[PDB]
From Swiss-Prot:
Topology in the lipid bilayer: Peripheral membrane protein
Family to which this protein belongs: Belongs to the small GTPase superfamily. Rab family.
Lineage: superkingdom: Eukaryota
Motif Switch 1 per UniProt: ranges: 22-35
Stated name of the protein: Ras-related protein Rab-7a
Free-text activity regulation comment from the record: Regulated by guanine nucleotide exchange factors (GEFs) which promote the exchange of bound GDP for free GTP. Regulated by GTPase activating proteins (GAPs) which increase the GTP hydrolysis activity. Inhibited by GDP dissociation inhibitors (GDIs).
CDD domains reported for this sequence: Rab7
Length: 176
């Protein structure tokens, strides 16, 4: 059982940090822009069930975005990340959501698993209100929302638990 998860979001929101924190329990304040898309794997237990989580990290900068988009189509869950201290990254969520739908072409789009992460909550200069973020998530088809901190490892395991659970459900429905 291989679960494919795709992480999308603007440059600098912390996609790579979140993945490394979750997969390797490691964080680095040093920024290294992601080029293209690639994955890291992590075997995990989803409600007493072993699965191989294939987590795809992508380039937030359009300049480093690859033309290869085949990795999308079989996705079981799409993770949308934004920076709680940067409203601009929150306003682009619809574009990221739409890009995922277009590239993955899931059947029954409105029910495909999306999980939103408001990252960098550890910073004092927060600018995106929780209520505002929850409202957007609700306007979608009520997709789960988690406020996280890759740096302080806050809510990372919890968020990925839901990501893994929902990805499994989607995966199961597909094979059926
Ligand atoms: N305060 C804080 N800063 C964070 C956190 N996670 C990442 N950052 C910083 O946000 C910056 C971007 O982190 P990355 O993980 O490289 O961001 P990205 O989304 O992978 O950027 P691209 O690969 O270019 O799309 C870096 O300065 C990180 O140190 C976090 O939880 N809290
Ligand atoms: Mg990156």
């Amino acid at each position: 059982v291989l679960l494919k998860v795709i992480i999308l979001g603007d440059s600098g929101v912390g996609k790579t940090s979140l993945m490394n924190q979750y997969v390797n329990k490691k964080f680095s304040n040093q920024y290294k822009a992601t080029i293209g898309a690639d994955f890291l794997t992590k075997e995990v237990m989803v409600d007493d069930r072993l699965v191989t989580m294939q987590i795809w990290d992508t380039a937030g900068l359009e300049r480093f975005q690859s033309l290869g988009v085949a990795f999308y189509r079989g996705a079981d869950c799409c993770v949308l990340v934004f920076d709680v201290t940067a409203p601009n990254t929150f306003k682009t969520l619809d574009s990221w959501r739409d890009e995922f739908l277009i590239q993955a072409s899931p059947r029954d789009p409105e029910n495909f698993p999306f999980v939103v992460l408001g990252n960098k909550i550890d910073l004092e200069n927060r600018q995106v209100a929780t209520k505002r973020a929850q409202a957007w998530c609700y306007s979608k088809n009520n997709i789960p929302y988690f406020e996280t901190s890759a740096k302080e490892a806050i809510n990372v395991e919890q968020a990925f638990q839901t990501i893994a659970r929902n990805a499994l459900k989607q995966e199961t429905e597909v094979e059926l």
